[PDB]
Amino acid sequence: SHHHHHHGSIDFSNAPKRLNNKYPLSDQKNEGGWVLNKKASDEFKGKKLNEERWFPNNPKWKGRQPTFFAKENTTFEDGCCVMRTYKPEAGSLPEGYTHTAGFLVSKELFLYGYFEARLRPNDSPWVFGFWMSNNERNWWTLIDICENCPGNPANRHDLNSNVHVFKAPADKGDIKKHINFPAKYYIPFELQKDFHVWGLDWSKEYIRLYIDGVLYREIENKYWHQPLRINLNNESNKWFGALPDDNNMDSEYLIDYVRVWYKK
Ligand SMILES: [Ca+2]
Ligand SMILES: [Cl-]
Numbered sequence: 001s002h003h004h005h006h007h008g009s010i011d012f013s014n015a016p017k018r019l020n021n022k023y024p025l026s027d028q029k030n031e032g033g034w035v036l037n038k039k040a041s042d043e044f045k046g047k048k049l050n051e052e053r054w055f056p057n058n059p060k061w062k063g064r065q066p067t068f069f070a071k072e073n074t075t076f077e078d079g080c081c082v083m084r085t086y087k088p089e090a091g092s093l094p095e096g097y098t099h100t101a102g103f104l105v106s107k108e109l110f111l112y113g114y115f116e117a118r119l120r121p122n123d124s125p126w127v128f129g130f131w132m133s134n135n136e137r138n139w140w141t142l143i144d145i146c147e148n149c150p151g152n153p154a155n156r157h158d159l160n161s162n163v164h165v166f167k168a169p170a171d172k173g174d175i176k177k178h179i180n181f182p183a184k185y186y187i188p189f190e191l192q193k194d195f196h197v198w199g200l201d202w203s204k205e206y207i208r209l210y211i212d213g214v215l216y217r218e219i220e221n222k223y224w225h226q227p228l229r230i231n232l233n234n235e236s237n238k239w240f241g242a243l244p245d246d247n248n249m250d251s252e253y254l255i256d257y258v259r260v261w262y263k264k
Pocket of ligand 1: 043044045079080255256257
């Protein structure tokens with residue numbers, strides 16, 4: 001029912017005001033005792049990718065057909081990482097692929113902390129994503145902080161969330177079949193119009209998901225105790241109606257920053 005079901009609406013009347021760029025938007029006074037991770041955080045200034053911090057594509061996933069991840073689709077302009085979608089000449093991509101999109105993967109691994117990103121969605125039928133994942137030694141889990149396609153006009157007022165356990169050994173959940181727990185919420189604004197701030201407070205006890213500083217989901221952390229990498233990308237997905245449109249593929253997915261904090 002997650003295609004139709006808005007569990008609730010998200011109220012922004014009491015959303016926190018921006019006071020500083022040093023702590024999470026949901027905790028601007030730092031009641032949680034955060035320290036900024038200066039290795040992993042990226043304000044995306046300048047003109048070139050920091051390839052010491054990020055892989056320029058996804059070395060382990062070519063992409064969901066028909067969209068193929070490519071390095072050239074990611075540039076850096078006006079203090080933002082900019083991801084675009086292209087359609088190369090016919091026959092240029094491997095079989096089944098027709099368009100290209102950007103993808104960045106963190107070289108650092110993380111387990112627990114605060115993770116925040118300021119994103120301006122692309123107004124095109126490509127899912128835009130800020131998420132975390134690891135598939136390692138028969139343990140494969142994923143936290144889908146942001147996986148949305150407001151570029152499909154039918155999804156403009158949706159805010160999705162999901163967490164996945166693709167596989168887990170006997171002592172870490174004993175999961176042999178993929179399981180996930182999606183939930184959608186209603187937001188009063190069209191998502192693709194402006195920048196918005198996605199936040200994740202990830203602890204051994206809970207996964208807490210925030211939008212523009214407002215808590216909108218709490219999950220009991222029963223399975224997500226595996227170190228994960230940060231992923232930023234565009235991709236195709238028929239479930240969101242996110243299939244290429246040659247007459248609407250000129251938009252830009254903008255990432256202003258990615259910030260990471262640790263405790264103590
Ligand atoms: Ca920036
Ligand atoms: Cl902001």
